[PDB]
Design a protein around this ligand. Sequence first.
Ligand code: ACO
Length: 154
Amino acid sequence: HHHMHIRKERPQDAAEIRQVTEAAFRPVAYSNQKEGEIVDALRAAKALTLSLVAEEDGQVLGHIAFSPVLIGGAEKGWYGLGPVSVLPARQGEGIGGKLIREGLAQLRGAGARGCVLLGDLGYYRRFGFKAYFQCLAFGPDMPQGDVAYHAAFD
Ligand SMILES: CC(=O)SCCNC(=O)CCNC(=O)[C@H](O)C(C)(C)COP(=O)(O)OP(=O)(O)OC[C@H]1O[C@@H](n2cnc3c(N)ncnc32)[C@H](O)[C@@H]1OP(=O)(O)O
């Protein structure tokens, strides 16, 4: 019962998810510390498409959010990945990678057409993202058009 496992969030997790998110982003120099707010706003708007936690000994160690993105104003089965957050002390152990791979697998399994993200130049290549935006297509390549994240992201 000391094993880490990944599962979908439940309503009872909201405070802890936000605590982990805010801890992860607190020292991030370009962060305006809105990532916790964003997750909660996505949830409030029913736009938190997928929300997974990594849990061990009843504690949330990490979290990932996915939400729909519009392309040229249209819903085309594309999602944005983020935020993803792991407790600072438990980073560099593969938790983030496990959350990302599992989240992508669940999106694909539910009929998604692709995922986009903004982030580190090289890290996300291990999940198939290719290069602003990085993109992972589950079928045809990403259709052209302005990418808009949900209003929660501002
Ligand atoms: C799209 C977005 O959401 S961008 C915003 C991302 N989130 C943040 O910036 C918040 C602060 N940062 C974090 O919370 C974390 O650093 C995250 C979520 C980005 C990554 O979570 P982690 O659990 O540390 O991810 P993970 O362990 O899979 O990989 C991190 C690095 O540790 C390395 N690593 C992990 N496990 C091992 C291991 N057993 N041996 C050697 N290296 C390892 C990884 O290769 C990676 O380094 P690399 O990019 O040079 O290859």
